[PDB]
Symmetry: C3
Subunit: 136 residues, 3 copies
């Protein structure tokens, strides 16, 4: 009983501190974070995996708003965890989308997806330097 309450309180304290610092954003069960570095898609995947997480992907409008707020705050385009019928990296077809008007427009050439600072998406090649955002 009391053991568990203190434990839960301390966890919420640490998450509160991280949230206040701008080191994380929590949406439901998901936690999004960036260290502010920009690298290509594969390198973001490697960085996220190294930390025990995955490259971020928005599966809901609230998750999209959260990642967009990161893009806007750090002022850079962001690579999302999807790959060209776009799929999540787990192999499932993407449900929620937020394409910029006219996108996706690069079938066969643009396999990745970047998010603009306004939260909309563009299919893009995977070799640009983009803000690394992970989800845990």
């Amino acid at each position: 009983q009391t053991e568990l309450y203190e434990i839960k309180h301390q966890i919420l304290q640490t998450m509160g501190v991280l949230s206040l610092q701008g080191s994380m954003l929590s949406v439901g069960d998901k936690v999004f974070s960036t260290n502010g570095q920009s690298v290509n898609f594969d390198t973001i995947k490697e960085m996220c995996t190294r930390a025990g997480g995955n490259i971020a992907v928005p599966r809901t409008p609230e998750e999209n708003e959260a990642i967009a707020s990161i893009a806007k705050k750090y002022n850079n385009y962001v690579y999302l965890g999807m790959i060209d019928d776009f799929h999540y990296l787990d192999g499932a077809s993407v449900s929620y989308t937020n394409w910029y008007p006219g996108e996706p427009n690069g079938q066969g050439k643009e396999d990745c997806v970047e998010m603009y600072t306004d939260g909309t998406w563009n299919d893009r090649g995977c070799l640009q330097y983009r803000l690394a955002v992970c989800e845990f």
Copy 2:
């Protein structure tokens, strides 16, 4: 048994890291933190709430010293969680006080309380930009 020990150890590790980084200060059951931003009283309240916490207030001399050390380290005055008979934001009358000599002196005009870098207090209007310190 062992499940709980590992969990507790990991929590203390994360708190240790945050403490070392200067991202938190722990006094008893309370954790104080700032992100170094300066905004007005209402905006600090909004920032703290957003992170799952509350604007910091010292209820003990040790808590006062902790928040003072934050004010001194970030070198800015700090708004405290009290409002003019001063009350905590939970509605209770303030017990512990540490007024600068001659304060409070602004009844009816100065509804907020700021802490100086030496840890003493002054009643002040609520519309200055002050270091945002939260408690969790």
Copy 3:
């Protein structure tokens, strides 16, 4: 059951965020961290203790690589938790070593141990300013 799973997941989320931020490095049960400050040996010990940890020491090749990566990333020599037969600060004789060629060479004069950015060690006096690395 479910209580514990959610707790464990949240802990791993916070550790993931800290890892991504570069605020910690995890090797087995140990967590290494620096705040980037440089001070002398005693002062590092005081800083680590204050945070609830201890000055870092590598007891395995993997731990050595981890601390070396911190030295390399922050680009400074690091004081290790050992003191001249070198002993850990717990009083036990050091097992794993990684001396730079020709070291240790300062018996009676060089009581501390610093790590270079390439991960090798040198016995040194204790009064230099070195990157503070703690272990939790």
